[PDB]
Short mmCIF file of C-alpha atoms in Angstrom, two decimals:
data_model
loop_
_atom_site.label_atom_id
_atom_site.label_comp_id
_atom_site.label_asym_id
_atom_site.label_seq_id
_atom_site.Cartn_x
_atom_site.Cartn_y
_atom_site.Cartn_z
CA UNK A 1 -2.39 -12.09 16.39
CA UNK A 2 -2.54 -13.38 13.00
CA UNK A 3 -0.41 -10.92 10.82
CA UNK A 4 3.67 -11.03 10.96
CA UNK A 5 6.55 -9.33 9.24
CA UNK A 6 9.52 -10.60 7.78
CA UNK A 7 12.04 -8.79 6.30
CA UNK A 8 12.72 -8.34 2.73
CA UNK A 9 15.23 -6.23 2.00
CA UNK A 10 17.33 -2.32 2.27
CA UNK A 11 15.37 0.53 0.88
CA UNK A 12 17.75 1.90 -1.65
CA UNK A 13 17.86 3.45 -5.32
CA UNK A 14 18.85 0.84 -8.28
CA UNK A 15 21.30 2.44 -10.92
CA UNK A 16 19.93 1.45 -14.43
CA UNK A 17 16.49 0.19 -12.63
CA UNK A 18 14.20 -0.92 -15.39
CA UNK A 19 12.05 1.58 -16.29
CA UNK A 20 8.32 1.72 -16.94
CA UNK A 21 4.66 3.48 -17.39
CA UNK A 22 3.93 6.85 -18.22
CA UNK A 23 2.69 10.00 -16.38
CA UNK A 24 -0.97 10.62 -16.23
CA UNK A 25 -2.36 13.64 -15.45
CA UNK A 26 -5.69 12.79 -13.73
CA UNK A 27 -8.71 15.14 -12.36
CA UNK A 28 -9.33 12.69 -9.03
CA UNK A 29 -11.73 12.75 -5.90
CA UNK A 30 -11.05 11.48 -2.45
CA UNK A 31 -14.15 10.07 0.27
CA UNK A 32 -14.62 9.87 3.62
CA UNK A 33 -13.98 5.92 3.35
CA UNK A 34 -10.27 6.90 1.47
CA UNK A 35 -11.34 5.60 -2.25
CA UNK A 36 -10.35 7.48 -4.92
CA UNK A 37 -12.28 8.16 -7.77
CA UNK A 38 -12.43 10.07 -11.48
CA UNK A 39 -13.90 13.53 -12.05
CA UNK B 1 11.58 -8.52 17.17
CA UNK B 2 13.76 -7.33 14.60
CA UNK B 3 13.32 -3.54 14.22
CA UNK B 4 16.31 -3.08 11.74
CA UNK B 5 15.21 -0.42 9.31
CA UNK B 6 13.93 -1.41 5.69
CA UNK B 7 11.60 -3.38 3.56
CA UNK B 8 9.41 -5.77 5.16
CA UNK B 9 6.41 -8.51 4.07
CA UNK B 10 3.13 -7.93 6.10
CA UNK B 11 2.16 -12.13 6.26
CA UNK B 12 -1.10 -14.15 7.59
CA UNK B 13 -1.53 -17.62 7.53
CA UNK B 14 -5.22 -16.87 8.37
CA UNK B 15 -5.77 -18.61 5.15
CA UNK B 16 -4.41 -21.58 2.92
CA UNK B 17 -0.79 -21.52 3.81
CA UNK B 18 1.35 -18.08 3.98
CA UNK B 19 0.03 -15.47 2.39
CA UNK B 20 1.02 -11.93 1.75
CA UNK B 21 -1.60 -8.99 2.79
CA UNK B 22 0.73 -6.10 1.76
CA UNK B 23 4.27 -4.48 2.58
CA UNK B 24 5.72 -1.68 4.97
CA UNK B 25 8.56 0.19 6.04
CA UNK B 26 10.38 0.27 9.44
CA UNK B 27 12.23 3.17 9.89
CA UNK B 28 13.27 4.63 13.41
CA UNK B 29 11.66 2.27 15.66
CA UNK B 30 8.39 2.62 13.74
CA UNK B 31 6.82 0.74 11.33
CA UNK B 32 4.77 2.49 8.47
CA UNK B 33 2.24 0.75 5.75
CA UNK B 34 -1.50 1.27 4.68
CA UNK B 35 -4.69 1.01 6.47
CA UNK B 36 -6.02 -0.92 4.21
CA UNK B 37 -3.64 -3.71 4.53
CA UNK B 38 -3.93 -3.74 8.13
CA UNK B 39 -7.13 -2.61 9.16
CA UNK B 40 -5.67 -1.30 12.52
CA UNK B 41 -5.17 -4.56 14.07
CA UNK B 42 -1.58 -5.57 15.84
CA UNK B 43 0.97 -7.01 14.30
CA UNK B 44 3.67 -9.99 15.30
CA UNK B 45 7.89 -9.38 14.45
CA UNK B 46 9.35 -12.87 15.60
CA UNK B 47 8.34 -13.19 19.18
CA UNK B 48 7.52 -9.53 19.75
CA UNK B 49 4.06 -7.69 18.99
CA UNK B 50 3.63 -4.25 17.28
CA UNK B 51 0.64 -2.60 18.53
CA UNK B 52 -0.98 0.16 16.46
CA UNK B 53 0.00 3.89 17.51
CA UNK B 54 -1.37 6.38 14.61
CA UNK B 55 -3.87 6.09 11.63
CA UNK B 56 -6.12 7.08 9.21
CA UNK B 57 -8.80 5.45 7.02
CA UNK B 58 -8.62 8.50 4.88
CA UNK B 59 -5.25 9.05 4.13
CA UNK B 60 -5.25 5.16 4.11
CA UNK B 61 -2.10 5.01 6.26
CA UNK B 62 -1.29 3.33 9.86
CA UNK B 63 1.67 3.61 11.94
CA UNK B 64 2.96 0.69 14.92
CA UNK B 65 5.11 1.55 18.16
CA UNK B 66 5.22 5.04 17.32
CA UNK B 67 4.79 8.21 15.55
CA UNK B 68 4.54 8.32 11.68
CA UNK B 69 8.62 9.15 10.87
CA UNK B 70 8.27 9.52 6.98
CA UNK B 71 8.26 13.11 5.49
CA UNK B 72 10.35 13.28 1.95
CA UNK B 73 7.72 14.51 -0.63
CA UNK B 74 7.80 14.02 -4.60
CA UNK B 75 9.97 17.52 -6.09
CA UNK B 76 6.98 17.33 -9.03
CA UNK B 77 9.72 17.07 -11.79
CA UNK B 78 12.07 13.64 -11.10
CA UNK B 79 11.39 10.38 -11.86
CA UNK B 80 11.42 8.16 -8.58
CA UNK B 81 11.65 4.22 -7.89
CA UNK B 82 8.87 1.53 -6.62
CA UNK B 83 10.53 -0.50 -4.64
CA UNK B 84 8.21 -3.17 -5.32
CA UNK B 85 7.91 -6.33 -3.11
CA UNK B 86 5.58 -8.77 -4.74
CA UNK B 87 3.66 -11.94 -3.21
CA UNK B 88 6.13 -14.73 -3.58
CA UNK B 89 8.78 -12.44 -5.28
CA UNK B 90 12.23 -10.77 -4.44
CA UNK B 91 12.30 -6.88 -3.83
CA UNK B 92 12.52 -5.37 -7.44
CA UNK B 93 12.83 -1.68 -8.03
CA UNK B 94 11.14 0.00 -10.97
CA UNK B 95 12.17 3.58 -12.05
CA UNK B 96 9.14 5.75 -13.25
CA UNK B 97 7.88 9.47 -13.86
CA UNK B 98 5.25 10.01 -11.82
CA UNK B 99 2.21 11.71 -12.95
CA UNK B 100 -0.40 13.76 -10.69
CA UNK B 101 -4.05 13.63 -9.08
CA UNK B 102 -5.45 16.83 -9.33
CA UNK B 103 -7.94 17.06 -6.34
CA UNK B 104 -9.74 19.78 -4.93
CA UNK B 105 -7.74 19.65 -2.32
CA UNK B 106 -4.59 20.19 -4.19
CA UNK B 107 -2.38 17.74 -6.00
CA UNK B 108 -0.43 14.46 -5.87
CA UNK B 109 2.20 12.34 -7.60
CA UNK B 110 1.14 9.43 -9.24
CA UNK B 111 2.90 5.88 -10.18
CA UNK B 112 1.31 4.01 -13.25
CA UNK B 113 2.18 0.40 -12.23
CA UNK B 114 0.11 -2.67 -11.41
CA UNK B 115 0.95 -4.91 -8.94
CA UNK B 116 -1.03 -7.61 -7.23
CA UNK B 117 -2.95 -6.50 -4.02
CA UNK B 118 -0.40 -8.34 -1.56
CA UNK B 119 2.34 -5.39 -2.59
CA UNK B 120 0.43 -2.62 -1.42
CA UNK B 121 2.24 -0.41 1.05
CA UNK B 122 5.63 -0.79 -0.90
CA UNK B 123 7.98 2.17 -0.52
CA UNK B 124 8.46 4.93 -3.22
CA UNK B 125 11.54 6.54 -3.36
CA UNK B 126 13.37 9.58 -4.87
CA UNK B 127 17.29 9.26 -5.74
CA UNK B 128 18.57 9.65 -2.56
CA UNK B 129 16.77 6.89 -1.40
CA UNK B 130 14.16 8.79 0.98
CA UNK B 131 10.63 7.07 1.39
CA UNK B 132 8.35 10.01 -0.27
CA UNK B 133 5.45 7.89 0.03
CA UNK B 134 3.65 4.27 -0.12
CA UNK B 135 2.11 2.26 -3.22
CA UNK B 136 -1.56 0.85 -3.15
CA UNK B 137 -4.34 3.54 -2.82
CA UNK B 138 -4.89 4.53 -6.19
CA UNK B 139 -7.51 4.54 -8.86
CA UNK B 140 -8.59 2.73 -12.36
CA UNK B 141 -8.64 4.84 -15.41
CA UNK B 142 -10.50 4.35 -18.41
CA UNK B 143 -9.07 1.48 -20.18
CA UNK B 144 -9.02 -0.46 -16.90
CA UNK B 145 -5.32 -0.19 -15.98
CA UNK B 146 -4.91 0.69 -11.97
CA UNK B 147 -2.60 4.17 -10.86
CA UNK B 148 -1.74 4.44 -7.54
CA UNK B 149 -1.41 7.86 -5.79
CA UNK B 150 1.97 8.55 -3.85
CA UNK B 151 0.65 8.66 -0.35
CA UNK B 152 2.94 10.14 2.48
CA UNK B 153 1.82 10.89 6.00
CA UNK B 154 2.48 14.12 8.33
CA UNK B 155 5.73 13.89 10.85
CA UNK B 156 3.91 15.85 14.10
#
């Protein structure tokens, strides 16, 4: 068995998190093989 | 092996040295990342094995030693976090407004970040700290930037 996990941390929200990118609203399509691509 | 819940690095050493395939997310005895990262196959946790239980090449997700837990979903109007574990790199949060996929299937959030392959399957979370999804199945838009869709799984 090849893979392993190690830990890395608690999943929790950052106050004052730097923030970044914007907010695209994309026409998308979805295959059988779980790629998406543009309309 | 440890099953403590949060964060964890999905590792091979497969090739030269240690290297980092992706990310995932233990919660409630199970552990949750993307197919993708994976491909199905078992996984190691210290001396213990995690053996595959659920997935999906479609909806790009994979569940070990149990059930897929995860089932917060984006409200469509709140900015969320990546908690974004990079190759090499500490856990770093990033605080974003999604956009959406429109499919014709319905639609999804969005997160317009780029981060090297090794982080897919790195949590994103709304304010309460709920998983509402994983980063790393996603799409590249015009200008040849990379958006990932928010993928979350179905709790049976």
């Amino acid at each position: 068995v090849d893979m392993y996990i190690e830990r890395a941390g608690d999943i929790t929200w950052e106050k004052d998190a730097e923030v970044t990118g914007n907010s695209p609203r994309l026409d998308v399509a979805l295959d059988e093989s779980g790629d998406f691509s543009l309309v | 092996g440890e099953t403590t819940d949060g964060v964890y690095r999905v590792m091979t050493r497969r090739l030269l040295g240690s290297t980092q395939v992706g990310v995932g997310v233990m919660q409630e005895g199970v552990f949750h990342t993307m197919w993708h990262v994976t491909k199905g196959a078992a996984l190691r946790s210290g001396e213990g094995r995690l053996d595959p239980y659920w997935g999906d090449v479609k909806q790009d997700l994979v569940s070990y030693c149990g059930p897929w837990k995860l089932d917060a979903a984006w409200d469509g109007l709140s900015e969320v976090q990546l908690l974004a574990v990079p190759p090499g790199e500490r856990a770093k949060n990033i605080q974003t407004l999604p956009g959406i996929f429109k499919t014709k299937d319905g639609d999804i959030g969005a997160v317009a970040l780029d981060y090297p392959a090794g982080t897919s399957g790195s949590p994103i979370l709304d304010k309460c700290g709920r998983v509402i999804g994983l980063y790393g199945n996603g799409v590249v838009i015009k200008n040849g930037s990379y958006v990932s869709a928010i993928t979350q799984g179905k709790r049976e």
